[PDB]
Amino acid sequence: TYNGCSSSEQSALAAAASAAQSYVAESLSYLQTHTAATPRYTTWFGSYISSRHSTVLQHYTDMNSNDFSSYSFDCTCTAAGTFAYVYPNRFGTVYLCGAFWKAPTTGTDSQAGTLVHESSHFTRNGGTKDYAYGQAAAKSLATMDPDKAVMNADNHEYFSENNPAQS
């Protein structure tokens, strides 16, 4: 369901959720077939180790079971700089803010990527935290502290967005 959303916002969210679902599905597939270090995995989750890969894999396996199209959206947040927020223990409800709207559907820091970001926040999906914000910061975190990177919402979004595309 939707709360305080316009017609434009509802359709943008439907497509965003559908694009998010596709992001998570391919990311899951990718993780199941790529069992060694690749530029895409290491850029976002740092040095390749099975234990961290299992954690990101589980995150995606759980996120994959999520039905993004059944999520409850709330568009009452007008904070111009914030994309969206969620309560880790209040599953399926995503509150969208101002910045979310000016973002593209897919791509870098997109609406669909934001859903992957927020979704990974749910304790049921793995409960990521907000350690670093942005590609610059996310990549740094992945080279400075892989453990945090695998528990960072943005690093999940960027691995899924994969833009610039890496193999």
Ligand SMILES: *[C@H]1O[C@H](CO)[C@@H](O)[C@H](O)[C@@H]1O
């Ligand atoms: C993460 O590290 C790997 C090397 O193991 C590269 O494939 C990638 O470019 C990134 O630096």
Ligand SMILES: [Zn+2]
């Ligand atoms: Zn977050």
